[PDB]
Amino acid sequence: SGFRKMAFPSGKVEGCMVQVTCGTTTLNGLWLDDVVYCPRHVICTSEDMLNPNYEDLLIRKSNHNFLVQAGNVQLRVIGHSMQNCVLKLKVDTANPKTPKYKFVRIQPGQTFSVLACYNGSPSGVYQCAMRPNFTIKGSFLNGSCGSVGFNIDYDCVSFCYMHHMELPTGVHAGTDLEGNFYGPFVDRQTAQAAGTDTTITVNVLAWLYAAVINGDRWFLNRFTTTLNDFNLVAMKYNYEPLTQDHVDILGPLSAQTGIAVLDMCASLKELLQNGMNGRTILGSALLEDEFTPFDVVRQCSGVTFQ
Amino acid sequence: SGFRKMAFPSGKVEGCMVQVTCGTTTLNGLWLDDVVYCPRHVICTSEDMLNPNYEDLLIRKSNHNFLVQAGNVQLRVIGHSMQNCVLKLKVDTANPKTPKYKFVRIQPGQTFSVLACYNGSPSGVYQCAMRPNFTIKGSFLNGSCGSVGFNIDYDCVSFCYMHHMELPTGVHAGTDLEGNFYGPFVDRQTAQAAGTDTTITVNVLAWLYAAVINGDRWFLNRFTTTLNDFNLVAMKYNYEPLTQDHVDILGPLSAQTGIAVLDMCASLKELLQNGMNGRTILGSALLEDEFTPFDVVRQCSGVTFQ
Numbered sequence: 001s002g003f004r005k006m007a008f009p010s011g012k013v014e015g016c017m018v019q020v021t022c023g024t025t026t027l028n029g030l031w032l033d034d035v036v037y038c039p040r041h042v043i044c045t046s047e048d049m050l051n052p053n054y055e056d057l058l059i060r061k062s063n064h065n066f067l068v069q070a071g072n073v074q075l076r077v078i079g080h081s082m083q084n085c086v087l088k089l090k091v092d093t094a095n096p097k098t099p100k101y102k103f104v105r106i107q108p109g110q111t112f113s114v115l116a117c118y119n120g121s122p123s124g125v126y127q128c129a130m131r132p133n134f135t136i137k138g139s140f141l142n143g144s145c146g147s148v149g150f151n152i153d154y155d156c157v158s159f160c161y162m163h164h165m166e167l168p169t170g171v172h173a174g175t176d177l178e179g180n181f182y183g184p185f186v187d188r189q190t191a192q193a194a195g196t197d198t199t200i201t202v203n204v205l206a207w208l209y210a211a212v213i214n215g216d217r218w219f220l221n222r223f224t225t226t227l228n229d230f231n232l233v234a235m236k237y238n239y240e241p242l243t244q245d246h247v248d249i250l251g252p253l254s255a256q257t258g259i260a261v262l263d264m265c266a267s268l269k270e271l272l273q274n275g276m277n278g279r280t281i282l283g284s285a286l287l288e289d290e291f292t293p294f295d296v297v298r299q300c301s302g303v304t305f306q
Numbered sequence: 307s308g309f310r311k312m313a314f315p316s317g318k319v320e321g322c323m324v325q326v327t328c329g330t331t332t333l334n335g336l337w338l339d340d341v342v343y344c345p346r347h348v349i350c351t352s353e354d355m356l357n358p359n360y361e362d363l364l365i366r367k368s369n370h371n372f373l374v375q376a377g378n379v380q381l382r383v384i385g386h387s388m389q390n391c392v393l394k395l396k397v398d399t400a401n402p403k404t405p406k407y408k409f410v411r412i413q414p415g416q417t418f419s420v421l422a423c424y425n426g427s428p429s430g431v432y433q434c435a436m437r438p439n440f441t442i443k444g445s446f447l448n449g450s451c452g453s454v455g456f457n458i459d460y461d462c463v464s465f466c467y468m469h470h471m472e473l474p475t476g477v478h479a480g481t482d483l484e485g486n487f488y489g490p491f492v493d494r495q496t497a498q499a500a501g502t503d504t505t506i507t508v509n510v511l512a513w514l515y516a517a518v519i520n521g522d523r524w525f526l527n528r529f530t531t532t533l534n535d536f537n538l539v540a541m542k543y544n545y546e547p548l549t550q551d552h553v554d555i556l557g558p559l560s561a562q563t564g565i566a567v568l569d570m571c572a573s574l575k576e577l578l579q580n581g582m583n584g585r586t587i588l589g590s591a592l593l594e595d596e597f598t599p600f601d602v603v604r605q606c607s608g609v610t611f612q
């Protein structure tokens with residue numbers, strides 16, 4: 001029993017974290033085989049921020065300008081290339097701790113673990129979601145750039161996020177591991193801001209199922225709803241539309257608990273309209289939306305990772 | 307910016323997790339140097355649960371009854387001893403991934419990371435606190451026993467918890483790594499239950515300081531209070547008494563923010579008496595008590611671990 005915001009074990013990623021320095025700029029890099037991946041603006045000074053031409057900045061650099069440290073070991077850069085907003089530094093040593101891995105670009109609403117790092121050394125691990133507005137509500141300070149987000153399946157690490165920027169509301173923007181930003185954000189100094197966000201409906205429903213699995217039913221009711229009438233209410237409360245695809249994905253949780261998806265939707269509707277009346281669900285006085293249906297199944301079934 | 311329930315990076319612990327099997331009972335063990343630590347009731351069958359005499363059960367066992375697996379490698383047990391409620395299995399191989407480590411028995415109100423494991427393989431990592439009633443609000447299923455809780459300082463892993471039992475309210479009971487239970491709990495089948503719990507006042511105050519650091523002040527007020535008058539209110543709301551020791555420990559956060567501790571106490575008093583009025587603090591509609599003052603400083607200052 002119990003239900004926690006659970007991160008993936010981070011050891012496979014810890015062994016990949018390094019420090020990259022360019023002039024006075026130091027940030028984190030990801031060392032996989034003989035390549036180190038990091039944000040391209042490591043090559044930026046403070047002056048090259050208004051509208052930096054990164055191709056022009058990069059052609060002016062030499063391999064020996066890049067100082068890459070793994071622990072107390074300096075790694076020599078022997079090639080470099082820019083891919084979108086990521087710099088790929090070819091180094092003279094392959095990382096002996098390279099896990100099985102892939103690079104994935106995730107959809108909004110998906111969750112992942114962040115290994116927050118400073119100066120190439122891990123500080124902490126936490127779970128978050130890609131918001132519908134393509135920000136993440138992270139915990140990142142100066143020096144955190146190049147920290148990565150990931151999922152693990154069996155023994156395979158799927159990297160999905162590299163950290164780049166903090167927006168004026170205190171939320172975070174970054175790229176996939178091929179250097180493409182999530183959302184409309186850019187790595188130049190402009191008036192960018194997070195767009196209006198929405199609540200991840202399919203995840204709220206997943207978490208209500210988690211609550212039932214863990215022995216709590218106070219919020220259930222005898223009613224059902226149509227998908228259309230539910231979405232009319234969701235829309236009013238700034239919830240994402242629930243698709244038939246979302247309904248299918250919730251099938252296993254609905255089967256495990258015996259509560260039809262549209263029945264759980266009628267519970268959520270009632271919760272939106274009436275509030276919790278001073279009660280809590282899984283220790284929360286708010287409706288939690290950073291657990292996917294898969295997160296719930298994994299934690300309530302005890303899936304492990306080799 | 308941002309503030310997350312952040313766990314320690316778990317890689318140093320992952321490399322220590324093994325599987326221990328005795329007859330039909332399998333649970334997790336912690337492999338440090340040439341010793342594997344696990345709950346002593348691995349030697350129990352279902353029948354030896356009413357009032358098992360563990361010394362009597364253990365003298366009847368042979369080394370070859372214990373099957374210890376690290377990954378795909380079987381480790382041969384060559385000695386054993388019982389220490390309180392932990393079994394120490396001497397094995398023929400020293401763990402080459404043994405970190406710098408120590409065993410600590412923590413006080414209620416302290417936090418730690420749990421690496422939840424099944425069949426010797428890690429499933430997830432999450433942060434929790436030792437409650438005042440010496441339970442933890444974990445997330446643990448059948449097979450989770452022997453999973454450990456820990457903190458990291460610099461490069462040193464301080465193990466403070468090994469998992470043993472789930473209580474009827476769905477919360478969890480376990481031992482330090484020398485086999486002494488936290489709280490009054492025992493590893494025999496009886497009517498044990500969690501005692502009434504209280505909220506960890508010093509941690510709530512720490513989290514209010516975290517909120518201020520992160521740019522939120524809506525709950526502050528112009529008032530101060532005496533320690534005594536605050537504790538009269540805390541007592542009414544089932545909060546732990548705040549000691550002068552707690553006040554001193556909050557000194558750094560008070561200095562960083564310019565808000566005297568007793569001033570923050572008057573804010574907490576007002577929050578207890580009037581509620582949040584539909585507002586949130588650091589994304590929560592409840593007063594959070596599973597961040598210590600040290601957790602706040604570490605996360606808002608970016609401390610790392612070698």
Ligand SMILES: *[C@@](O)(c1nc2ccccc2s1)[C@H](C[C@@H]1CCCNC1=O)NC(=O)[C@@H]1Cc2ccc(F)cc2CN1C(=O)[C@@H](NC(=O)C(F)(F)F)C(C)(C)C
Nearest residue numbers: 041049140141142143144145164165166167168187188189
């Ligand atoms: C990351 O650690 C980096 N720092 C530097 C420093 C010099 C060169 C390159 C980098 S990457 C930080 C993480 C950030 C900082 C502070 C608090 N929390 C965080 O997550 N990233 C930045 O400082 C980025 C980097 C950048 C790249 C190109 C630019 F043209 C401008 C920047 C500045 N920056 C920001 O995050 C800024 N935010 C924005 O510009 C915006 F639009 F996203 F809001 C800043 C105002 C500095 C937070």
Ligand SMILES: *[C@@](O)(c1nc2ccccc2s1)[C@H](C[C@@H]1CCCNC1=O)NC(=O)[C@@H]1Cc2ccc(F)cc2CN1C(=O)[C@@H](NC(=O)C(F)(F)F)C(C)(C)C
Nearest residue numbers: 347355446447448449450451470471472473474493494495
């Ligand atoms: C742990 O994985 C272990 N399982 C076994 C099985 C056989 C022998 C030894 C062990 S240790 C589980 C973890 C637990 C189970 C299910 C859900 N969440 C969890 O955290 N621990 C147990 O099953 C313990 C072990 C035990 C030892 C001595 C006993 F006399 C009795 C038990 C049974 N047990 C419990 O946790 C039970 N709880 C209690 O007895 C009490 F008092 F704490 F509530 C149970 C009712 C089975 C949950």
Ligand code: NA
Nearest residue numbers: 221223263266
């Ligand atoms: Na219903």
Ligand code: NA
Nearest residue numbers: 527529569572
């Ligand atoms: Na005050």
